[PDB]
């Protein structure tokens, strides 16, 4: 009758703080850090014709897993 908790967010400090709060709040396995999912967006710097000059933006998703035996905005939970 174990419980699986999956936490996703876009700020690593936020995920770590939320996981620590959930752990502190009588047998819970350590938070397993799943591989981070990163996306890169390349956009044109200029609104008109300048193809060479480009800007790069990043969006990261951090995932933690909690196995329990025996919420700040921006964090999605998958309690099951």
């Amino acid at each position: 009758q174990k419980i699986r908790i999956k936490l996703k967010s876009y700020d690593y400090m936020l995920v770590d703080k939320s996981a620590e709060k959930i752990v502190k709040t009588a047998m819970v396995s350590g938070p397993i850090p799943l591989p981070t999912h990163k996306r890169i967006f390349t956009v044109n710097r200029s609104t008109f014709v300048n193809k060479k000059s480009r800007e790069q933006f990043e969006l990261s998703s951090y995932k933690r897993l909690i196995d329990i035996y025996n919420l700040p905005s921006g964090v999605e939970v998958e309690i099951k």
Partner: protein, 85 residues
């Protein structure tokens, strides 16, 4: 811009949503019956535009805006999670 284009897009979306008969005909053969439907009811006439400026090019499905609008909000810190590399 050209608000008539946005009105056209909204009308096309409404006509496409108003769907089940087309799905049933496609599941069957019934191509002669599919010929009878209005052309604006077909989903191929739906074109993705920026949700605020109506720009028909440089679309981004993840955020629903053009590249220029995306760059503006990413620099302004309005899209959560997105940061400059």
């Amino acid at each position: 811009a050209k608000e008539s284009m946005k009105a056209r897009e909204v009308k096309r979306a409404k006509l496409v949503a108003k769907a089940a008969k087309r799905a049933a005909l496609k599941a069957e053969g019934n191509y002669e019956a599919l010929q009878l439907l209005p052309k604006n009811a077909s989903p191929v006439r739906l074109h993705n535009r920026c949700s605020m400026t109506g720009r028909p090019k440089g679309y981004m499905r993840q955020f629903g805006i053009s590249r220029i609008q995306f760059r503006e909000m990413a620099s302004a810190g309005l899209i959560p999670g997105v940061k400059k590399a």
